[PDB]
Structures are given as C-alpha cells and as structure tokens.
Amino acid sequence: MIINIVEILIFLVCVLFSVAYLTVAERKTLAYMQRRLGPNFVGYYGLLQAFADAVKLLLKEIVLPKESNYIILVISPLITLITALIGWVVIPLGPGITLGELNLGILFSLAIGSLGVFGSLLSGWSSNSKYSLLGSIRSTAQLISYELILTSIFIIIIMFVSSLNITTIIETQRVVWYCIPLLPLLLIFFIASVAETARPPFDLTESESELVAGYFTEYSGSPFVFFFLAEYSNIILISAFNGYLLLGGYLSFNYSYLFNILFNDYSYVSFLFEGLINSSAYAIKLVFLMFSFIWVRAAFPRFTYDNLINFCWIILLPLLFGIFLIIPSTLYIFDSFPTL
Amino acid sequence: CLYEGANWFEREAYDMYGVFFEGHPDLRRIMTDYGFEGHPLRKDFPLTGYTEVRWD
Amino acid sequence: MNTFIIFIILIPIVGFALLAVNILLAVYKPYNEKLGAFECGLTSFNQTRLAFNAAFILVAILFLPFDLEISTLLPYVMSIYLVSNYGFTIVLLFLLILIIGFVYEINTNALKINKHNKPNTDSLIYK
Amino acid sequence: PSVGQDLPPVGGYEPVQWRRNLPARGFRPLVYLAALCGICGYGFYRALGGIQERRELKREK
Amino acid sequence: AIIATAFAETVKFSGSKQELQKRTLALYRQFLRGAPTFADLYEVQFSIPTIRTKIRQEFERHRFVDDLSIQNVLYAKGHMEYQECINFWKQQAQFLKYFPEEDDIQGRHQPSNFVDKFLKNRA
Amino acid sequence: ARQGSFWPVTFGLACCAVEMMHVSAPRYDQDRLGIIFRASPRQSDIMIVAGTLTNKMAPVLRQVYDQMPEPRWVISMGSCANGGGYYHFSYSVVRGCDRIVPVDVYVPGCPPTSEALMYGVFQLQRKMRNTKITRMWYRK
Amino acid sequence: RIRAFTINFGPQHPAAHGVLRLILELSGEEIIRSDPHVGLLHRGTEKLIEYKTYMQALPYFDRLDYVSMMTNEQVFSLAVEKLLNVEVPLRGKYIRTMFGEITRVLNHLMSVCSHAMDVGALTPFLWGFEEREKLMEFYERVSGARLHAAYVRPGGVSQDLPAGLLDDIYMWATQFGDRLDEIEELLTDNRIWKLRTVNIGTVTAQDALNLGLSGPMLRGSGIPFDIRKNAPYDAYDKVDFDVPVGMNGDCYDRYLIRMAEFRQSLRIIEQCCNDMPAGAVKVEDFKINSPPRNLMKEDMEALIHHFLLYTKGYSVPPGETYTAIEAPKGEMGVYVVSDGSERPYKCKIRAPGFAHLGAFDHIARGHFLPDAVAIIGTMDLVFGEVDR
Amino acid sequence: RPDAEKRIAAVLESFDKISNPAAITPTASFAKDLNLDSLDTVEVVVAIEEEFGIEIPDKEADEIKSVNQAVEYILAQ
Amino acid sequence: NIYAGGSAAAAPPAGFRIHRPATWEESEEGALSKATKYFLLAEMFRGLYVVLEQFFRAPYTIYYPFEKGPVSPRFRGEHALRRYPSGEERCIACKLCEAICPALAITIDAEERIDGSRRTTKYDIDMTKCIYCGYCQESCPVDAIVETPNVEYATETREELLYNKEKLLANGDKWELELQYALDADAPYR
C-alpha cells in the first residue's frame, strides 16, 4: 500500500514536470531557429519559466461572460485536463512498467483519444456566439477527421502483433522496429499526430478563425492553465504512441555483452541500471519526437479548411485503403500470420 | 459608372468637402467619426474643431 | 488496490485543487462592460440563426460509417492466425465492399465546397 | 572644393551577388525510391522472419 | 465596389417638391419602424417612444425650409444617418450624442435671467 | 510571478507598432524577458497604447481595456499616445489615452526607441516589485 | 433569399494589421459582400499641412506610410521642387536614389514578412526584421532618429553622409544577397505556401486600370508600367536595372515580383555605391534652404537668410502640381496647390493603398474566409496611407 | 373583426392633438376629421401595424388616409 | 514610318507573346520521378533543412541594460539647454526654436534681466507633443538647445514629462561631457 502510492506519486511528478518544461524548451528552440535566445531572465539559464507563467496565471481572475453557461465553461477544462492526463497510465517505461498493466492497453489508449474531442466542441457552446460556434465546428470536424486515420494506423500495426497489449508489442519489436519496414507509415502517422493536437502546421482556429485566440479566446486563469496543460500533455502523449508502436518503445540495442562484462548477479543496482537504459532509450525517442513537432512548427504556413479536408479524405485515406489491402496480403503470401 | 475605382475617391471628396456626386451608390462618410457634424477640409471649419472626447 | 485506480481518482483531485486555488486566491470584481463576448473590440448583434454548407454537416455524418468499419476490422486483427487463408478472403471482400462505397463518395465530390468566384466565362459577343 | 567627404574607391568595389543562388541538391528521385523500397523490403524480411520464429516459440510453449 | 451596402440608396436629386415630400415621408416611416431595433441594438436605458419622439422632433426642426436644393442635401444627410444607425456602425456613445439632456441633469444654478447669466459672466 | 511572465495585448496601430515589432525582433528580444503577445485582452495582463487615439476609436480602446482581468496595468507608448502628440490640434484625435484609460508608465519618443520601450517595461516591472498585494491586506 | 451572416474583422485582430474594421457578410464560408471601414486611424493630417510651412509640413509625410519613410519624403520634396523651379545637385540625386532603395528593401522586407506571418510562416518575420535592424542602423547614422527621418528635404538633402558609411553599405550588401536567397527557400517552393496563394486575388488587366491599381498589383497582372522607368526622376535613368512583372493576376505573381525587386534594389545600391560623385548635397542657394553653420556665424547675408527661412520660410510661386512617384506600395503622388504664400493653400496625398483597399470587394467576392487574409497581405495595407 | 376595429380605435385613441376621443367614427379621415399632420398620418399607421405584427409595403402605406381604409386593409393576413 | 494615332513607338516588345503552357505529355519528367517528389515531399524537406541549419548558428540578441545598441552622434533623445564655458545660460531668447517646431511644443517668455542682457524668463517643452524632428537644434544660432542621446527617461505621470527651464538646464548640465562627444563629430556636418 505504501509502495503503490509512492510509485504513482513519482510518475505523476515526473510527468507533470515534463509537460511544464516542454513549453520552455519549445520557446528556447523556436528562438534559436529564428536566431534569438529564449527566456533567460527567470532562472539561472531560463529554467522555471513555466512556473512563473503558472503562478501568475493562477492569480488572474476568472471572468464568465453573460452569454455563457458558467458550469460548462469551467467543466470543459476539467474534462480536457483529465482526458489528456488519464492516457499516461498505459505507456511502459520498460518491460511491464506501467501504472496499470491491462491486457488490452491499445483499446484504452484509443478510447481516451476519442474522449478528447468533446472539450473542443462543448467549449464552443459555452459563450454561444455565431462567430465562435462555427469555429468550434471547423475544429471538431478536423479533429475527428484525422482521428480516423490515427485509429487506422494503429490497426495496421496490430496486424503484426495480434495482441492489444503494449509491452507485448515492444517485446515483439526486438527483432526489428516497425518504422523501418513501414517508412511511409511513419510520415503519415507523424502528420496525423500533428493534426490530432491541432499544431500550427495544421491549425486554423488559433490564428485564422474569427476569434483571435482560438475557441478558448474569452478565458483567464484556471480555464486557461488547464487547456494549456492539456495541449502539451497531448503532445507528449501522441509522441508516446509513436514511441511504442512505430519506433522502439524502450529498446536501443542488445546490451547482453556489456552486462556480462559489468555485473555478476542480479541485484538492485542491476535493475536500476537496466531501468535507466530502458527509460533513457524511450526518453530519447520521445525527445527527438517533440523536437520534430517544434521543428515543423517553425518552417511552415497553415491550411485552409478546404485544403485540410481535401488532404485527409481525398489523398491520405485512399492511400490508406491501399495499405489495408497490401499488408495482410504480404503477411498472406509468405506463410506468416502472427499468433496470440 | 465608368470607373469601378472612382467611387471611394468620390466619397472621400464627399466627407472632407461636402461635394455631391449624383448617381452614386454608397455615398456617405468615410475616414471621419460616424456622428461627426461638419466637413473638415473647408475654410470655415476651425482646426481643432467643435467637439472633444473624454470618458465620463 | 492496484495503482491503476489511484490515478483515475487522483488526476481530478489535482484539477479540482488548481481550480480551487484560482477561485480562492484571485479577486472577482466584475461589471457589465467587462462581461460580454469578445469580437475584436467591437460589440455587435448576433444573428439568431445562420446558414451553413452541406459539406460541414456531411463530414461528421459521413465520419461514423467509416469509424464503424475501423472498429469492425478490430475483431479480425486479433484472430488473424486462427482464420488462416479463409477469414483473410472474407476480410478482403468486406474491405472491397467498403472501398466501392468510398469511391462513390470521392467521385461525387461530396466533401468539396465549390467557389462562386467565376472569372466571367462568357466572352463579349456584340450587337 | 570638396574635402573630407566619403567617396568610392578609385578602382571601385567588387561585384556583389544578386542572382538567385538556388542549386538543385539531392539524388535523383528514382534513387530515393529505390532506397525506400530497399529499406522497406529488408524491414519486411526481418519482421516476417521474427513472426515465424515467434510462431515456433508458441508451438513449444 | 460592384454591389452596395444593404440599406443604401443611390443619391438622386428631385426637381419637384412633392417627390421630395414623398421621399421624406417614406424616410420618416423607415426611422419609425426601426426604433425598437435601435433600442435593442444600443442597449439604452429608456423606452422606445422617446426614440420615436426624438425622430419626430428632428423633423420638426426643418419643417419651414423653403429651398428645394437645401431640402435635398438635408434629405441625403438624413438617409446617411439612417444607414449608419440601422446597420449598427455607429456605437452607443455616438448614438447617445442625440440625447445629451435626457441622460443627466447637468447641475444646479441654470442661468435664465440677465442677473444669473451675469454673476458667472455666461460661464 | 507577475514579472517573469508579462503578457501584453498587441493594441499597437500605427508608427509605434513597428517599433514594437522591433522588440519582437532578434536584436532586442522580448521572449528573453518573458514577454509574449497574447493577442486577446482576456489573457493579457497589460495593454500598450502604441500609436494615436482618434475620436472614432476611444470607445473601442476602452472596450478592449474593460475586458482584461483585474490585475491590469497599461503603458503608453509614443508621443501620439500621451497628449495627442504631433496631431495635438486636430479635430479627430484624443489628446492622449489619459482621458480614456488609466495609464501607469509613459514611454516618450515619437518613435520611442526599442531601447526606450524596453526601459519602460523595466520601469513597469519595478512598479510590480513594490505593489505589495499581501502586505496591503495587513494594512501597513 | 440568401441571408448573410455579418462579421467584422475589427481592430483588435492580429491579421487586420491593427486598424482595419472589415464588415464581411458570408454565407457559409464564401464572402458575398465586403465592406472595409476606415477612419480609426484618421487624424486630419491634410487639414494640418495647410497651417504649417513647407519645411514644417515635411514630417507629416513620413508619419503616414510609416513603413517606407524616405519615399514619402521624396514625393513631397519633388512636388515642391517642381513648383520652386530649382535643380538639386548631382550628389543629392544619387544619394536619394540610394536611400530610396534601402527604403524599398525595407518596405518589401516588412511587407513580405508580415504577409508570411498573416498566413502562418513565423521564421521570415524574424529574419527579415533582423535585416531591418541592419538597415535602421544606417538610418540612425544618416539622420538622427531611426524610424522617422526628415532627411529628404524640398531643397534636396538634409546634410552630408557620415564619414565612413559608403564602405559599410557594401559590407552589408555582400551578405544580404545570401540572406534573401534563404528566405526564398521555404516560401517559393513550399507546397503549402503555393496552394494557399495560387488563384487567390486574381486581377484581370482591364480591371486593374478601372480600379486605379498600380505598382506591384498592376505589374502582378501583366501590364508593364513603372514610373522610375517610364517617367524617370532623381537619377534613375543613369542607373541600370530590370523590372519584374507577373503574368497571372494572382497573389503568387504579386509575390514573385516582390521577391525580385529586392534583387533589383540591391543592384541599384551597388551601382550607386560605385558611381557616387563629389559635390554639394543641398541646393545651391540660401533663399530656399539654410546656410551651413560655419558660414552663417561669419556672414551677415547668410545670417539674414538663416533667420528668415525658419521664422517665415521660403515662398513658393503660385501654381498647382500633381507629382507621382513609385513607392514600393505602388504609385504614390501628391497634389499641392500653392497660394504664393509660404504655407500650402492645399495639399493632398494619393495613398497607394487607398485604391487597393477600395478594390477589396471587387476581388474578394466568392473567396473563402482564410483567403480574405492572404489578399490583405498583397495589397500591403499599412493604414498610415489609407486614412490620414 | 368587430373586436379588431375596436383595437384600431383603441390604438388611435392613445395619442395627442385629438381634443375629442369620441370623434373616432368608422369613416374618420386622419387629416380632416381628426386634425392630424403630415407626419402624424405615418406615425399612426406604423402604430397600427405595430399592434398586429404584420408589415406593410409603401404603396399600401401611402394610400391609407382614413380609418375606413385601415379596416378595409386589415385582412392582409 | 508614320504611326496611326493612338499609336506611338511603344509597340509591343519583341517576344511579348506568351508560349502556350505545356501539356502533361510534353514534360521531361517521368510520372514516377515527379510523383516521388510528390509523395516524398521533397522541397518541404529542403525548407526543413534550411531552418535546421539555422539552429546551429549564432543568435543576434544583445542584453539591453547591460549592452546597448548602436549610436550615431546625430541621434536624438531628450532635450538639454547647454551652458557656455564659465557658466552662462546660452539662450538668448531668439524664439527661433519656437517658430520652427512643427508640433508647437516650445513655449518661451523672455524678459530683459538686470544686466541688460537678453535672456529667457520661462523656457518650456511639452514632451508629450514633441516629435523629435531636431529642427529646434538645427535652428538655434547660439546652439543653446540640443538633443542628448538619452532615451531612458520614461516616467509615470504626465506632470513629470513637462520640462520647464530648470529641468532642461539640469539636463544640459548633466549631459555636457557627452554632448561634447556628439558635437565634436557632428558640427562640421551641420
């Protein structure tokens, strides 16, 4: 009882910090892409900037305008917050290191990413304006339209494992990663990942819509800190999904020979050293991936909604139907179906 | 009617000068205040004008 | 007591606590010109109902029959070894029956919105 | 008279670059596609070999 | 600017007085129908008949004008003021230019005779 | 916390707005101070009146200022924004936003140098050092 | 009955360039009727020029169109030169050719990068504003202040160059030639930047004339016309360059001709750094601009002239002129009526962006709502122009 | 209908410049019988159509001179 | 020849006719070569690699209260009334700075003092309607008022931003060592 509450404390406090410093690291690298320094006036080298934002942001007042339902206005940050945060269970930081190991962890990871659409759409009706409602329409339609191909990429990957467990996928992956046979799948899963959060390659709401600040324009204080946390938790969460089913989850190399040199016996320093290597490999996958998100933010203009829907439904999805047909046929031609 | 681009100009020459252009769709004021009484670029209108603005 | 359910109980208490520290610690102090929705520093009348395009509603009506297939392909992907050579052909036929309805959709250009910005096609015939 | 002004050099300056400097870089696209198909097909080799090995392991268990 | 604004009218000058009388008649009807829209639109404190009597009084100002040409410029200015008021381009601070004396009593000591004007030398 | 994060609404409208976009430039950075333009007054701490104020915009400037949450300041950038400026004797101008919004720091300069605008920001942050929000409630 | 929902792009909007209220009536996403409002920046600068002398009226021009100062200075100075019947010296012509082109480089730099932000590219904004800082240093050397410089005067030029600037504008040009190839890489052959700007804002060549459109928007649409080649002034005849003129009237050919006027402007700067002569920088006589402070402290005549050109001013012969030059925004001119007194009887700027924003609803019918914003960035609305 | 003409007269009663509210006969001319002005006619016709919720065009508004013509008009709905 | 009327030697240039746009079949690229660039996003990756190159270079930012940017001596900031060597006020009340000021910021009253010398009783600048044109510095024959390159004097009230004679004499006191450096390099060019 003491041991499960200290593990969930330490995983909480490791993830809730790492979503705060993501935004600091984002302003840093976006600054150096644009040939300027990031923040360096808040900590010794600019660190705990996000804590300055957060402590001030909790001190701003909450205004609830006259056209709004005040409950819905404050409950959509809570449900978007928890939905962007409940999905952090099922990721493994090593073999069978989750916060709940269940036999079907992809179906959970895929049902929570389905629950995240509501806090966009529902937030459109709170402070009902006809210039706000239609922007929420465009956002929600984009959000579901790219969730389709997200779910489809998943099911194409589970064609190779035939197990909804996640550490089973990563143990299956030890022979070869799934990015290196399925290279176009990495590119289209990356762009569907950029779409599913509404990053500013694929954004229209925050910048172009009739609101100057997206669907969440009229806010202040706690309803803004919860959305802000939820977007970057969504960043590192879809980064985690890419990290386990397409790149290696915790796998870097074999490291049996290095152990047979170093160690003599199973001991707690050996499990500690192995845990550091496994979570280091997972972390460097996930950090290269958040750098790719920030890197594609820097270089590009944005999309018309027509360009966006024509992109998803007319270009990527027929190609995906060809992928549905070609990959079980390749597992068919050679005598290799995956066993439970 | 001849020129598609003239009308804004005509309408600018309305608001500063009060000159009329008969046969003009959308003749009204431009680049002054909405409730502005007067025609500014005109020798009887004083420089600083007639009114001023504060927050009561 | 696994450590799975501490989490699903424990995220909300963190969120309720941050919402509570905002409600307790910030001032409230509103009035009428502070209230009111934002559009670019200008109030206006909102129209009671506005029109929309058929493709806007058609994206999310059409979304669900593709979503229901993607969850229908999910029973197969777990049993893919057992139905060797046979459930393969059945899933082929299922996907092909879907793909021809999809090519109906892409041939009709149902999700495309046209532009009424026509460049005056008709030339100048005189007299 | 005009003393103490800034004047150009007596030989003039060297010519600057005002043409577009956009040289075509990269391999031919058929090289990238051939490399793509090679990287993919070697990946399919290792993946389907691992699937068959895992099937024999399931037989043993 | 091919197409014009919604409640626009191409400005046109009438050589007869009775056509101008018909047009000012139609224009009073257009102001008078739109007064509930103005009271809703500018969020004013008072009642709709005060807007309607303001509209009547502003036509009572210019009744005995003789010159048809001056009646014509006066009509065109009035239709422009209508087009600004009905489209909601004017704001509530310029809509309430029209009501300077209703909103607040300016204070004590209103000078009426010569003596009260003299003690403050017209202020 | 009120200093190290410092969010203005980008009200700047004329000559002095480009000079603000030199505070966004890579020579005089504002990200390195913590400054970012949340371009909605519902989230900005402060406002910058950077440019003129005509009589057609004075209710609009107030309606933008009315909205911002209650710990709010405003700095007045330029000489057209404090006391009319170059256009002081004009029929359609407000003689400074002092008439409309209650302003805390005046930054003078007709194009007030990006050096000087940043110095006005440092002066406002010094005013935030001695705000004493919690010592005040003890009734010092 | 197509009932249209009405919106504004009001003032507090990032893509509205600050001051632009834009009533748009849309049906779904297509715009069926547009209506720009303007006057939120209007200050009556033109009523104020009539109460100031010409030398005091000189800053009213770089206050408006505040992105490109020296060109606004130049149009009023050339109109007054035409009225005054005086000839500026040779060095004063080559020096206002050169500072009329780093003003052009700075204008296209601000314009292209602000457009690329309004669409969504973030990095050219900062790279271009860096190059703008490298040029504002040159303005700070030449005049006093950076953003507003009263350097180009009706007699000619304010004062001489500083001692070592000519070796410096070369050192900048050598690297700027590469600093602008780099901004060209992630926009010109971006498929996103292409698709977002292909048939947007299409202007037919016969409609570009009825609307009064000029500069990059008239040369977007096929017609080969620019004032510095057609009716040349200020020693642009002596300097060799070419002109880019698009073929389709879209926003992409309005983009591609801006990208090449950088090239042609850098060519101007090099050819004027090499061929700069010596001599006087202001006009010959002290009845229209002031003597040097060496001379007026020694000379009784020149002290009289100095004390009179500032209390009273010089007097202009009675007449009327419209002088038009090519700002980087397009054709900008000024119509000034001279009383014969020392105050102008009447001034009037023709803002180039006034006719462009006035031609908005002719073009922006039937386009979507995102494509009503990339069309703002091509007509280059700085709003010191449009209202004043 | 009978009640509707009473409603027309009850609207027409609530004005001024009528020193005889008992002078509202079914053939009352606005200008002649009631002493109404050039503006008062289209004041009262708009006040009549406000009572019902109908809207009237210009050629059916300029012609109304008597309460007889308003009660003849009433059945547009 | 002779030209028609409606006709100059501005004929169309040799080659003003376009060439017809190429069809798909008259193109040098193969379908496979073109569509490899299509599905493998070629020029997008090129523009990506540009800003990746920019990640690895030197930024431009200077740290403002510790490092100041460029200064030429011609630069203008707040105002200062200088003094002669051996301390005399230099302002002979000639009203030339008042007569030229394009925004009417200067106001001066002048009286003959006890010595019989012409001096200003009141000198004043409104810094809220000053526009920094430097005409007031160009106009003065004694060179009594100048522009110091100080821009760091931002205030919190308007009353503080109205500079009488005493604030400007204290500025021309304070900055005199610096205005020496400015007018040693400017005064030939004036």
Ligand SMILES: CCCCCCCCCCCCCCCCCC(=O)OC[C@H](COP(=O)(O)OCCN)OC(=O)CCCCCCCCCCCCCCCCC
């Ligand atoms: C012989 C075998 C068969 C060979 C073919 C192989 C098939 C499998 C390959 C699949 C890979 C697909 C990758 C996605 C392709 C997207 C296609 C595309 O570029 O979009 C085209 C679209 C324009 O559409 P269209 O109308 O046709 O244009 C005609 C112009 N007249 O233009 C657009 O929509 C805009 C482009 C949007 C692209 C999204 C960019 C966002 C993020 C880029 C991710 C970069 C990743 C970097 C990550 C780190 C890298 C280290």
Ligand SMILES: CCCCCCCCCCCC(=O)OC[C@H](COP(=O)(O)OCC[N+](C)(C)C)OC(=O)CCCCCCCCCCC
């Ligand atoms: C840290 C590991 C990063 C690996 C790079 C990412 C995956 C590979 C992507 C393929 C792009 C490529 O490398 O193509 C190679 C080409 C250069 O060939 P060429 O000069 O055009 O001659 C071709 C002439 N033909 C056609 C006749 C044969 O492009 C480049 O080098 C441009 C710089 C990209 C550098 C990327 C880092 C890799 C070092 C390469 C140094 C030559």
Ligand SMILES: CCCCCCCCCCCC(=O)OC[C@H](COP(=O)(O)OCC[N+](C)(C)C)OC(=O)CCCCCCCCCCC
């Ligand atoms: C349209 C698809 C056409 C494919 C044509 C390729 C023929 C190449 C011949 C090599 C076969 C071989 O020799 O490799 C055999 C391998 C390894 O098996 P093993 O364990 O070593 O055999 C031991 C036999 N036991 C188990 C009984 C002891 O198995 C494979 O499955 C790999 C096949 C190559 C991958 C081809 C994928 C093509 C890309 C498809 C993109 C969707």
Ligand code: SF4
């Ligand atoms: S303060 Fe100066 S630069 Fe700024 S808008 Fe006004 S006149 Fe222009």
Ligand code: SF4
């Ligand atoms: S400062 Fe100069 S111009 Fe002004 S009154 Fe004194 S001497 Fe005259």
Ligand code: SF4
């Ligand atoms: S700098 Fe210009 S505005 Fe200021 S006092 Fe001198 S002349 Fe007047």
